[PDB]
């Protein structure tokens, strides 16, 4: 994506009803800090999800260690809060060649203060004045009270610790809802083969067959409630099972 917002107004995209391309995630390998939870990253290729939340933002190259489920520091204190029990992956890389511009990048922002720690996964776009001392400023700025937000200072004159990371966070769950988002061998003809089609499993001799399905159908069956004939998913064809 071409434009991530800051952490005071981070973008969130509910994703479901599609398939996961988890391969090139690992094959990318241009990513600085790439960690996961729940169960191992090699294991998550197939172990799949009811409803994922893909939310992304841009933070500094020093504060990204604050992004960890159950830590402190400003981004996890007042800006964006990972929960106490978390599943997803934190994906983090540098975008110094895009974000930090000569003449100064000050598009990006963050919240520096709030009168409590932040509830998990809840943004804070309320840019009203907080009153640290007791003297009421009441919407306008003043004494004992500060402005809530502040920018970052990004230029390519920054060191490597001050480079902008485009942290995208993937968060997962499991419900009574089915695995709506879920990740992914040459067929044998006229030869005894073990097989699986679409999860249907058995062992037989697969042949070409002229029995004619209705389109929506999957299996055929015989009188005996055996699985007699199946249709090849990738290339629709009517395959007997003997």
């Amino acid at each position, epitope marked *: 994506a071409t434009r991530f917002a800051s952490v005071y107004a981070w973008n969130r995209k509910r994703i479901s009803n599609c398939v996961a391309d988890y391969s090139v995630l690992y094959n990318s390998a241009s990513f600085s800090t790439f960690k996961c939870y729940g169960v191992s990253p090699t294991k998550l290729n197939d172990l799949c999800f009811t409803n994922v939340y893909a939310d992304s933002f841009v933070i500094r190259g020093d504060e990204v260690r604050q992004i960890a489920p159950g830590q402190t520091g400003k981004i996890a204190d007042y800006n964006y809060k990972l929960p106490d029990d978390f599943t997803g992956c934190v994906i983090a890389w540098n975008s110094n060649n895009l974000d930090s511009k000569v003449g100064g990048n000050y598009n990006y922002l963050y919240r520096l203060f709030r009168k409590s720690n932040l509830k998990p996964f809840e943004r804070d776009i309320s840019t*009203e004045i907080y009153q640290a001392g007791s003297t009421p400023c009441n*919407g306008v*700025e*003043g*004494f004992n009270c*500060y*402005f809530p*937000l502040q920018s970052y200072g990004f230029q390519p004159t920054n060191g490597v610790g001050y480079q902008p990371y485009r942290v995208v966070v993937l968060s997962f769950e499991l419900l009574h809802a089915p695995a709506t988002v879920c990740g992914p061998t040459n067929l044998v003809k006229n030869k005894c083969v073990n097989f699986n089609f679409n999860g249907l499993t058995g062992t037989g001799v697969l042949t070409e067959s002229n029995k004619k399905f209705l389109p929506f159908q999957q299996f055929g069956r015989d009188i005996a409630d055996t699985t007699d004939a199946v249709r090849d998913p990738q290339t629709l064809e009517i395959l007997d099972i003997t």
Partner: antibody
Amino acid sequence: QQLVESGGGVVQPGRSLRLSCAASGFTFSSYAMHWVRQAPGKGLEWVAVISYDGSNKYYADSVKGRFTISRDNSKNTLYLQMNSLRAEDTAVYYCARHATLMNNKDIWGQGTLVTVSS
Amino acid sequence: GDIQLTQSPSSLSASVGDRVTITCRASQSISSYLNWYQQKPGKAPKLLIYAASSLQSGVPSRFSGSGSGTDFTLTISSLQPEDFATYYCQQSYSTPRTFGQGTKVEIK
């Protein structure tokens, strides 16, 4: 990034003249905004605030003429109607912002002349 | 009542390469909430220092702020031929805000 102002002109005293000032580059919406006055040869005198992030309006009691201030946030614009005029207010006005130890957002309009004379 | 400012001196005709200390004094004890502006007469007031002790983008350290409480200081150093203009201090402590009367640094 940029601030534009409504047109100044010569107005008879006791009248009213709405002041429009539209923003560009970044919104009015998340910030406050101010008005200040510069008479020729005189110092910059603050006039009035606006505070959109709640809603509150503060006026200078030095020039307490009920110069009313409110918004058009969706156009990033701000309206202060010149009420209860008197000739020494004949000056140039600016749309303003104060760096309150946190930001660096002090952006100033181009300046238009209000004139109070018959 | 209001908070009075005291900008001293209200003008100082200066020369090349000086180090001018334009003082803005305050009637109350203000934490650091004071600013500084560049105005050639007819321009927009270009902010110079924020919170009385911090520089600004585009403005090098030839300007330099310090002070707190009542006493605030504009530390102009190595005075440049473009720096000769009408300048201003600024409270943001309470409401109303007042600005100083201005100090015109000008060529001797």
